[PDB]
Amino acid sequence: ITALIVKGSNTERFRDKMNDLISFMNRKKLGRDLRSQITGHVRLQYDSHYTDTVMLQDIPASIRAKIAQLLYLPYIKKVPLFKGCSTEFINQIVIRLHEEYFLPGEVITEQGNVVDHLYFVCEGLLEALVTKTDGSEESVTLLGPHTSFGDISIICNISQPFTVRVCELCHLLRLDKQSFSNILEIYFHDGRTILNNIMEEKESNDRIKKLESDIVIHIGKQEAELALKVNSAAFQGDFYQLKSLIRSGADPNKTDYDGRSPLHLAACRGYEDITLFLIQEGVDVNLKDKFGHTPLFEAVKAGQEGVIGLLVK
Amino acid sequence: GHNDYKYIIHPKNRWYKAWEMFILVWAIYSSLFTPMEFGFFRGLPERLFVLDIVGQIAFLVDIVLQFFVAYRDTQTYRTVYKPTRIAFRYLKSHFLMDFIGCFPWDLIYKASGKHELVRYLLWIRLFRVRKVVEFFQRLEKDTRINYLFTRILKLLFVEVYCTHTAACIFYYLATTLPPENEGYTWIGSLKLGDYSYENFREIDLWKRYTTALYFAIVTMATVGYGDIHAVNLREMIFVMIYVSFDMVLGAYLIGNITALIVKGSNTERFRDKMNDLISFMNRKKLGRDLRSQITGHVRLQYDSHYTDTVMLQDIPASIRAKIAQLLYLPYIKKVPLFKGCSTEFINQIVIRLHEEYFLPGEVITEQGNVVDHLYFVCEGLLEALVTKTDGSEESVTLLGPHTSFGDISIICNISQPFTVRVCELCHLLRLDKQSFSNILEIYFHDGRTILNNIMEEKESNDRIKKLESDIVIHIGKQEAELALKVNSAAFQGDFYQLKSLIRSGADPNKTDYDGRSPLHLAACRGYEDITLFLIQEGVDVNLKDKFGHTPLFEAVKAGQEGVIGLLVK
Amino acid sequence: LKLLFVEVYCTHTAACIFYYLATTLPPENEGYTWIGSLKLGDYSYENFREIDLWKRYTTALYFAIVTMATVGYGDIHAVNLREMIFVMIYVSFDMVLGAYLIGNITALIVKGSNTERFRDKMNDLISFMNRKKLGRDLRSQITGHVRLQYDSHYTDTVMLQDIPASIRAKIAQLLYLPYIKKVPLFKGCSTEFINQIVIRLHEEYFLPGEVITEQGNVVDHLYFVCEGLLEALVTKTDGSEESVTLLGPHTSFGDISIICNISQPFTVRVCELCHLLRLDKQSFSNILEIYFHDGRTILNNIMEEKESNDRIK
Amino acid sequence: GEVITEQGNVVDHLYFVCEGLLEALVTKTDGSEESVTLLGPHTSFGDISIICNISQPFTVRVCELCHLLRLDKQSFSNILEIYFHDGRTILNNIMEEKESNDRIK
Secondary structure (H helix, E strand, O other): HHHHHHHHHHHHHHHHHHHHHHHHHHHHOOHHHHHHHHHHHHHHHHOOOOOHHHHHHOOOHHHHHHHHHHHHHHHHHHHHOOOOHHHHHHHHEEHEEEEEOOOOOEEEEEOOOOOOOEEEEEOOOOOEEOOOOOEEEOOOOEEEOOOEHHHHHHOOOOOOOOOEEEEEOOEEEEHHHHHHHHHHOHHHHHHHHHHHHHHHHHHOHHHHOOOOHHHHHHHHHHHHHHHHHHHHHHHHHHHHHHHHHHHHOOOOOOOOOOOOOOOHHHHOOOOOOHHHHHOOHHHHHOOOOOOOHHHHHHHHHHOOHHHHHHHHO | OOOOOOOOOOOOOOOHHHHHHHHHHHHHHHHHHHHHHHOOOOOOOOOOOHHHHHHHHHHHHHHOOOOOOEEOOOOOOOOOOOHHHHHHHHHHHHHHHHHOOOEEEHHHHHHHHHHHHHHHHHHHHHHHHHHHHHHHHHHHHOOOHHHHHHHHHHHHHHHHHHHHHHHHHHHHHHOOOOOOOHOOOOOOOOOOOOOOHHHHHOHHHHHHHHHHHHHHHHHHHOOOOOOOOOOOHHHHHHHHHHHHHHHHHHHHHHHHHHHHHHHOOOOHHHHHHHHHHHHHHHHOOOOOOOOHHHHHHHHHHHHOOOOHHHHHOOOOOOHHHHHHHHHHHHHHHHHHHHOOOHHHHHHHHHHHHEOOOOOOOOOOOOOOOOOOOOEEEEEOEEEEOOOOOOOOOOEEEEEEOOOOEHHHEEEHOOOOOOOOOOOOOOEEEEEEEEHHHHHHOHHHHHHHHHHHHHHHHHHOHHHHHHHHHHHHHHHHHHHHHHHHHHHHHHHHHHHHHHHHHHHOOOOOOOOOOOOOOHHHHHHHHHHHHHHHHHHHHOOOOOOOOOOOOOOHHHHHHHHOHHHHHHHHO | OHHHHHHHHHHHHHHHHHHHHHHHHOHHHHHHOOOOOOOEEEOOOOOHHHOOOHHHHHHHHHHHHHHOOOOOOOOOOOOHHHHHHHHHHHHHHHHHHHHHHHHHHHHHHHHHOOHHHHHHHHHHHHHHHHHHOOOOOHHHHHHHHHHHHHHHHHHHHHHHHHHOHHHHHHHHHHHHHHHHHOOOOOOOOOOHHEEEEHOOOEEEEOOOEEEOOOOOOOOOOEEEEEOOOOOOOOOEEEOEEEEEEEOOOOEEEEEHHHHHOOEEEEEEEOOOOOOOEEEEHHHHHHHHOOOOHHHHHHHHHHHHHOOOOOOOO | OOOOOOOOOOOOEEEEOOOOOOOEEOOOOOOOOEEHHHHHHOOEEOOHHHHHHOOOOEEEEEEEOEEOOOEEHHHHHHHHHHOOHHHHHHHHHHHHHHOOOOOOO
């Protein structure tokens, strides 16, 4: 009997968690409203299976990805922003999602604020609020189940369109915007597809199109910018970072805005060993810059007998 | 529904709270008196009849009140004030039991020919003990009293109820037998001292109750003298049931108290670590000053509960951000390394910092050690050490509050060539290497501002001037990429984006890696507006590249007569 | 001990109060008290207020002690309602007291001891050895060494790594540094340097008769003998071992190879005891490579000390 | 399915695949990490990063339960510092064996 009592008690365990957080709040003199917020959400976790997530640590990240695709993926597919988006991007978004529950009244995001988190609503109902001239909320709309907020502040890179506060206990899957945009800068198709899904919203909302994004168009020339960075790295001489840039698929044959390849830069700076490694990758032997120069011209103009000999080879 | 209706009151309302404690008191009486009225009384005498009437009146009013109290719904976690839902909650949870026990069962037994079977419904009133249990639940919710200690207090209360009911039931079993076979009962054959419990229905109520409770209490502790024991088969059977159940209940009491002790206070964990290190002190014959210093860190680990952030992870990241913003932002804004930096970038900093405390004389970072963390100084004072001649006190400036260090190990990928040494208790703030790198890449503008801060910081603070020099190299490095971007923008056609870059402060004259300033590229593209913006900015219009190509050469090579005219102008 | 004192005091006070409640009835009704109606064997406590004090106190304390353990012989029991109520109160509070006594004792046992912690460690080790089916000689060596780890309590130096590196350093500076100063390999050197060596020292106690260093391996640790007598073995390639010298206290083996890039110069066999001080070879390289000129000096120190024995000569 | 190593991340263990089948992967542009090789029993990986003083050139995921043998970067480095010619025999064998799998080739 003593062993089973000592084993644990859910109420007791979350009770120690409250006592520790109370000590923390007391020492740091946290705000009374925020004190209520902490205690309320910790009582919520007493019922929000906080342990499951802590237990998932042992469960391998791949298995966590699969269970994520088993639970979040239906709900996030039903979200209208991701209809017709590549299934790989939605799998990526699902894997990095984090379960977060919220008590009624918890102002999770506030209008015109820095939004680093994109919240997908799964169970619950929320409020859209815009600050009035005096300061009162104007009750824009009610976020029902299976929506997503924080998106406008993220894609449009603007302040939060409206304060979101929940009427009821809700279940939102949090996404930090940093990694989100990073994948957006990788999944180009979903880049443009989410811009189309939000373009319908633009056709319904002026605030969105007001600050449109040129990210995908830049991506059309992101290959040129990458190649620019590669050529700069070849000028740097750091083989590690240079290789990493080539690892990104930066064919040495790719050129900058002026049509200059790393072969020319290796010739210019006497990077004979870089020239050898460019030869392993077979940079276009007579590739011309916008001044019409095959790499012999710079190889000899720098007089790099190693580069001259290698390119004559 | 709080304002939609007026008769409904909050479950935690003040007036209803007073009524709640009053009904708690009355539950304890009506749950500790019903066994007495059942066993010792075969029909209440007409002396406490008004007490029974008032007892049922109080719980009738409780029945009425439980139809006007709101309730926090389990699912929505919001208080629900729907009158129909309030009623449906009460009727389908514990209404019927509380309504049956509200009946005047005394008068029903008196009127119905004393059937003695109706009297058993008095035990339904025991369900009012629910109000006690509920109370203890509320008591276990508050952080005022330990969960285990409230558990043991509840167990003691349960033992009180069980022994009271056992005594009442034992005497009732004595009363089931007719007054002629009383010699075969546990009380009818009792001869404690020289007093004979012969007519055990004529003795005063309190003597009989105290005898029955005496047996129950000694049975509960299983001291079991033997002076009072069971005689009948009914008494034997009930004693066996009660004794087994009390074995289990007392075992739970011992288990709960033992679990409370085994959990222990952090005081004992700290005391025991103190103990094994005191042992080590005596085995190793340590110096007394050293001993006090060891006890120093021991007390620090007892005292510094900074690991509650590991609990804070459960609370959402927005709320965590808010807490960080109000405990770290004032300190971070005063760090000179972040002067000129954007507020969003600083907030993002503040979200990812961790607290760190160290005793005086301790060391956090070390020279020649690859450090993966940036530590800001907020309280206390610190002192790094660049060993230059065999660590001949080759220390570093006393690292005051509102500062930082280890930032150079991140900015220029250095091995952190100084051993920071603690002088007083400091609230150091920890930032991850990958974290700081990625946010730097998000806010490269603010990062360049950061190096523009470090240059002046270390020009006077020569202790980091050497690293400043290396950072100037890295400054050139960032200039390279930034320079290229500027030129790229002018070539790409991003006129407004190029304005944005220069508005952040991008140097326009900056040439690319082959000495081509963005003026060259804009002239080549033919962008009249970009070209005029660049010549206005101050880009050199005459500097040829490393290949003898002046901006005029770009203008005429591209043949853009507008750009040629602007450049000649 | 405090709880046992509470037990003793409570039983003594309970016996005194019980006898007092026997005295709260006039001698007319002594037969209705607990002691007045007491007839044990042949002695009748009829005129109990006239019996000798130590004959009444011992009886009352006998009742109290018996009820304290709840053995409840029943020969002495409560008769009055006064005594009934008091015995109820005492029995309940004694039940709580005994629960606390069992809880305190159980907590002390549950807390365990280095004996049981060692026992656990040994059980896992031998479980591992049989799991991987080692040989009895090898198992003997591991078990002997771990037993010695317990008996030397250098398994209990594991707690000091929790203590600050500065405080650990000073503890080492007071304990290890005495032996290290007497090691001529470090003679002539800055106190700071030997100080660092002592900072990175590890206590390594070994079997009195054993082998810890062999010849031709790659040095990874330096063992300064501070306690016990060891020996240096040079096994001739014909198949016969030869002990070159004895590696006693204040003598160092391994350092010769550690300083240079040569392999292990000789075997070491321990004879008397082995409180060895381990210094990681790679760590010794670190403290040499900081280059405070002390490495350059110890080079000369080795040069002057390379006449110890024919092997090193 | 465990991620043993990662491409571009320096790893300081030369694991010796000994009990099981591995799934050493290589991330491509499309986002799918194409396997550099499925290390089966009595195989090996990690030396390529160590001996060449580089990061791991492949993100290693796992096919089946794999028992492995850790060997520290610095220690092995110290070992090859003393034993160099043996290391040179390693380089010969790495060339000849990598011929087999064009991915490790």
